[PDB]
Structure formats: C-alpha cells, structure tokens
C-alpha cells in the first residue's frame, strides 16, 4: 500500500553567508599571497 509519500532529504539539506579563511602558511594553498607585499607589509 504505497498511497502515501514520505519525506526524503534534498540536495540543499547538506552544507556547502560564505566565509573564507586566508592562511599565508607555507602549506596553505594561499601561500603565494606572501609575495604581494607593499611598503614591507603584506
């Protein structure tokens, strides 16, 4: 007896306003930002 339809999670129910962490560490993918230095301060 499949008359009724029950809930089921949707795509947007899972994560993905936006917050970005800028890390200048050597391993961090944004390490290159250390090059862009003006007046001796990055």
């Amino acid at each position: 007896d499949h008359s009724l339809a029950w809930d089921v999670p949707a795509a947007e129910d899972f994560p993905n306003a936006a917050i970005y962490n800028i890390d200048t560490s050597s391993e961090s993918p944004d390490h290159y930002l250390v090059d862009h230095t003006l007046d001796g301060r990055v």
Binding site: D1, A5, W6, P9, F14
Partner: protein, 498 residues
C-alpha cells in the same frame, strides 16, 4: 556441519522496481545508469553526469510495519526499503515469516553511509529525538530484528565496499556452526550527499564518463550506484526453494601494501581464492563462471583477473567464463556483492548468462583475455553447468570470496494427482496485490511447487493483510474471487445434516 543454502532473495536496484524487472533489464541489454536530475543537478561540482539511481525512495507501507507517521517521516529511506525488501525476500523462499518469529535467526546488514542521520540532525533546536532511532547506523539491523522478532545477532558492519559479502560470509559462518538456523543478509546504499561523490572524484576512483567499462582497455573508474538487496539463508532442512548451496566463504585483508592503502593487491586475492576451494574440497576445473569484482580501474582490473588466472586457470582445459554485473548497473559501494549474487542467481534460474556491457577491446595488460583461457560474457550464453564463484574486494583492503553450487533439480515426473484441480489462496494489502497473486498463480497452474509455496505464505492474520482472495486452478468454472476480510475472530461451527 550442516548444508547452507540461499533460500530466498529480493531487492530493488537501479532502474528496476524489483528482481523481475532487474533481470529484464539485465538480459535485455538495457543500460541502468541514467543522466537524470533526481538526486541532484547534473554536473554539480564537476561530478560525472551518469549514475545508477533507484526509481523512487519516498514509498513505505508504515501501517503494516507498525510505524507511526511522525516517526516514519524521519526514517532513513534505506531502512524503509530494507524492511520492505526483507519481507519480500523471506516469502520468496516460501517460508511464512511468522514461522521464524521467536527463533534464533540472525541479521547482518552491510551499510556504509548514514547521510540521512546527518541531514536530520542539522538544526539543534528543530531536531526531534526519535529521528536517531530511525537513522542510527546500528538501527539498520536492530529494526529488522525488532519487527521480525529475531533473537539472533543483529549487526551492521561497514567493511568498506565489501560490506554485503562480508555480512554474507559472517552469516554463513554463523549457520555453518549451528549458532543460528537462518539468517538475513542485506546491503543498502543510497546517493543523497553529493559531497561524498566529490570526495570519491578527488580520490580519482570515479570515471568522468560514469561508465564501469569492466575489463576493457578504456577503464577509468566506476560509477556510483544505488541498491537494496536482501537474501535469506537457512540450513538445508528448512529451505523450501534453494537457489544454490554455499560451499565455502572466506575473508582476508591485503595487509601492508607498499603502493598504498587504496592500491589493490593481487597475490592476497589469489591466496584467498586458492585456500577457499582447497578447504572446500572443490577442484578448479569445476568452476564455470567467476563473478570478478570488475570495478573498471586501470590497476584493479589487471590485478584481480591476473589473480583469478593464476588461481583457477593454471590447469583447466576449456576457458573459464568471466563477468561483472557492475558494467550493467554501475557500482553500489556496500551492496556490490549482493547485487552480483542476485545477477548470478537470476542467470542460473533462467539458464542464461547475462551479457556484459561496454566491453569492446580486451585490456592489453591481461594476458588471459588476449589468450583463450579467460573469456568474457559479451552476449547471452547458455548455462552448461558447474560451480560458480563470487568475489568482492573492498577498496580498504578487505577481500571476500564465496563458492556456490547451483541447484539443478529437474522437474518431477508427471503424476496422476497433477491432473486434479488445485486450490490457491492469496492475501494482500490491497485488492491489486491479491489479484496479482491470483493471476500469476493461474498463469503457472501446472507448477505444483509454485502453488504450494504460494499457499504456505498466504496464511496471515486479517488485521495485518485485510484483503483475501482465492481461485480454483484446473477447474473449468474457475474465476478469481476477491473481497475484504472483516476483522475479529469468528467461531467455526459444523452442521451434520440428516
């Protein structure tokens, strides 16, 4: 020990509402992978477009299973589909489920994802408690044990991609040693969290085309798929219908590998295969078909088939048939093993080996394929008859392998009582179900075993299944009769006329 047989089977698979439709797709050459937008927008995050997805997930007969609507809405779709599929599988063997209530039956479930529980616990304030009871990983088996009233072990083991076959092996061990008289083995997998697919893609396992071109030169990676499969195992003295006999089933882990944890190993798999059908007492020449893992990777495929060739092709004369159901319906991670077992059993039942899709050129790295020793099933092939073997190697390292002796029971010789008209009784949730049962029974009026199996299961209390029907088979004045069954016990009274 005691013989272990696969009494019943059932489940839902991509683009297939049941096993009959699954076989129709398998032998018809229909590709089950699809480019639909059901789970999420195609191409999101760069993911491959194609994927094997079930027809529907939002269906569940809560009232029959005694689950209230509020609790049902928060149940994992995996669990609901598994409940339905398990009930369907139990009857498939002709066993009335009530016969097992209170027994020592055990349940093993191979589940590798709990995305639903994560989704339902999003908001700390909104979330309700009974959400966990229906979404917890362990609850996958405990719900089955609770509803069906099985007193045996209730476990839910991940073991990466080999969960289903690992559970099958554990159930075989339990039954073989007399711990349990029967067991339920299930593998469940659904696609609801695209981030998991993104993880797999970054790992490089997924193929951009989304096609598991097993054994072919163009092997890139497997395509994620969904499925829900359940199998009922019992000692031979209890089984009514036997699909096959489990001769042996072992396990072992690849251990330390220089290349990496994910890198498959061939020597370990060959050792496992050799040890299995050595301890089983079977000779290699008996094997007629080996369901290779056949993921489709560039390294996994050469490893396993080369391992199969060393393990079983060392002395046999005629070629050994090879196949991989993952080329038809993608690759369901945890339920991979049970899907392959279902394909093998269906092919044995119909006497034909389902073909393999997307195979055009053999992989040059595999000497056997170029040679005649190992032959792929690229088209329907009649079943000659012999032992069969299924293996499933989880990417983590766990390996599982089993050996089956297909059941070969010729139809009984005609008997005078066959001409006698027979009675068929059916019970269903709705009139459509009862009418379907009666029609199928009528179409096969001369299958005495089929009629007996149908009769045995129809005995269900009216409260659970309120519609009942019957039909006299072999009688000229025979028309199916259906009507609702009033609830409540009714006294029975005899009258001896004058």
């Amino acid at each position: 020990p005691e013989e272990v047989v696969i009494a019943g089977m059932s489940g839902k698979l991509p683009e297939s509402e049941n096993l009959q439709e699954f076989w129709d797709n398998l032998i018809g050459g229909v590709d089950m992978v699809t480019d639909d937008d059901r789970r999420w927008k195609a191409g999101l995050y760069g993911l491959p477009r194609r994927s094997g997805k079930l027809k529907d997930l939002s269906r569940f007969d809560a009232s029959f299973f005694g689950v209230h609507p509020k609790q049902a809405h928060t149940m994992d779709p995996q669990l609901r589909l598994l409940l339905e599929v398990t009930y369907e599988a139990i009857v498939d063997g002709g066993i009335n489920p009530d016969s097992l209530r209170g027994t020592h039956t055990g349940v093993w479930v191979g589940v590798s994802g709990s995305e639903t529980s994560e989704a339902l616990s999003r908001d700390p304030e909104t979330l309700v408690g009974y959400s966990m009871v229906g979404c917890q990983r362990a609850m996958m088996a405990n719900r089955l044990s609770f509803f069906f009233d099985f007193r045996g072990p209730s476990i839910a083991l991940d073991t990466a991609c080999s969960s289903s076959l690992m559970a099958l092996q554990n159930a075989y061990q339990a039954i073989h040693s007399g711990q349990c008289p029967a067991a339920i083995v299930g593998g469940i997998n659904v696609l609801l969290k695209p981030n998991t697919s993104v993880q797999f893609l970054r790992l490089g396992m997924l193929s951009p085309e989304g096609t598991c071109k097993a054994f072919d030169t163009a092997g890139n990676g497997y395509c994620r798929s969904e499925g829900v499969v359940a199998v009922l195992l019992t000692k031979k003295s209890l089984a009514r219908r036997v699909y096959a006999t489990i001769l042996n089933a072992g396990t072992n882990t690849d251990g330390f590998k220089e290349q990496g944890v994910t890198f498959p190993s061939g020597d370990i798999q060959e050792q496992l295969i050799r040890s299995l059908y050595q301890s089983a007492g079977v000779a290699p020449e008996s094997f007629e078909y080996i369901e290779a893992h056949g993921t489709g990777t560039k390294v996994g495929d050469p490893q396993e088939l080369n391992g199969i060739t060393r393990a079983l092709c060392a002395t046999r004369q005629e070629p050994l048939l090879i196949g991989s159901t993952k080329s038809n319906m993608g690759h369901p991670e945890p339920a991979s093993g049970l899907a392959a077992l279902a394909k093998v059993l269906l092919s044995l039942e119909h006497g034909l080996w389902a073909p393999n899709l997307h195979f055009h050129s053999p992989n040059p790295e595999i000497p056997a394929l170029l040679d005649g020793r190992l032959q792929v099933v690229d088209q329907p092939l009649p079943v000659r008859g012999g032992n069969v073997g299924i293996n499933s190697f989880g990417f983590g390292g766990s390996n599982v392998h089993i050996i089956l002796r297909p059941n070969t029971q010729p139809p009984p010789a005609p008997a005078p009582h066959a001409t006698l008209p027979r009675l068929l009784r059916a019970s269903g949730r709705t009139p459509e179900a009862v009418q379907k049962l009666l029609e199928q029974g009528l179409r096969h009026s001369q299958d005495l075993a089929f009629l007996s199996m149908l009769n045995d299961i129809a005995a269900v209390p009216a409260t659970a299944m309120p519609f009942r029907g019957y039909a006299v088979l072999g009688g000229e004045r025979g028309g199916p009769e259906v009507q609702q069954v009033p609830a409540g016990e009714r006294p029975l009274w005899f009258i001896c006329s004058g």
